[PDB]
């Protein structure tokens, strides 16, 4: 089915990557600047970039792996919880409570909308319309995604929708027949 994650291993890999991105962005901030700057103002007038990269990396991957491990499935919700943790780390830099709540909620919603579309910038090859079976079914078969039919099985309607509202396993007519 699935495979659980190594939260400590993926977290320390991301911590090293965020440390590296912080050093690169601090050097790019020195060299693209004005005023008296030296070799030691890399981490002095840094603007706190290495804290941004480090905290965002560790929080997103730790909350993503922990939420994927306690739910025992991988879907778009884990990106929502991880993006909420990222928004918590980015929103604590502005030391205000309603700001913080806004950063958490909106960053979590944006990352959940990201992770629900596949969590990929690029395309998936087998899932797109162009590389998948489309059009009508040629004979009767299990109608896969992207396919059209004329008539659907009623057993599927009872299994997917329910046995309730106006919906029945037998139409209301021949359930009421004279013999």
């Amino acid at each position: 089915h699935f495979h659980p994650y190594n939260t400590l291993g993926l977290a320390t890999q991301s911590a090293m990557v965020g440390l590296g991105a912080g050093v690169v962005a601090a050097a790019a901030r020195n060299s693209l600047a004005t005023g008296p700057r030296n070799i030691l103002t890399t981490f002095s007038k840094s603007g706190g970039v290495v804290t941004i990269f480090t905290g965002a990396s560790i929080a997103y991957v730790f909350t993503y792996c922990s939420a994927a491990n306690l739910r025992e499935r991988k879907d778009g919700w884990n990106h929502m919880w991880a993006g909420a943790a990222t928004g918590a780390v980015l929103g604590a830099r502005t030391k205000l409570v309603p700001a913080f709540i806004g950063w958490t909620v909106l960053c979590g919603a944006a990352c959940g909308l990201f992770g629900w579309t596949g969590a990929r910038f690029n395309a998936d090859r087998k899932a797109s319309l162009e590389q998948s079976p489309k059009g009508f079914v040629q004979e009767d078969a299990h109608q896969t995604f992207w396919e059209v039919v004329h008539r659907r099985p009623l057993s599927l309607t009872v299994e997917q929708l329910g046995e309730g509202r106006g919906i029945n396993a037998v139409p209301i007519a021949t359930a009421t027949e004279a013999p």
Partner: protein, 92 residues
């Protein structure tokens, strides 16, 4: 006999060295003269690899037209330049 072995590597080192005197030279036209030296190191490498024709095409075209154009610009025009101070490039 094996004194003639490391020539290519020597030119590589020599070419490396020449670029540091291009980007760091107090006078401009002295650094453009170091660039002329770098064309000569290139033509050494092109003879050394087996392309003796190109080496003289580089000395004809790059040294004798493009560098002459550059020196000819720097003469009768005004260019300010600052020295390689440690304080301005230690941030880089």
């Amino acid at each position: 006999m094996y004194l003639t072995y490391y020539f290519i590597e020597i030119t590589i080192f020599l070419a490396i060295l020449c670029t540091i005197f291009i980007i760091s030279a107090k006078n401009p036209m002295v650094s453009i003269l170091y660039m002329i030296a770098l064309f000569v190191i290139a033509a050494m490498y092109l003879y050394l690899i087996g392309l003796g024709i190109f080496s003289l095409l580089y000395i004809m075209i790059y040294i004798g037209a493009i560098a002459v154009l550059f020196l000819f610009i720097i003469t009768l025009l005004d260019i300010n330049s600052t020295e390689l101070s440690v304080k301005s490039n230690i941030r880089d």
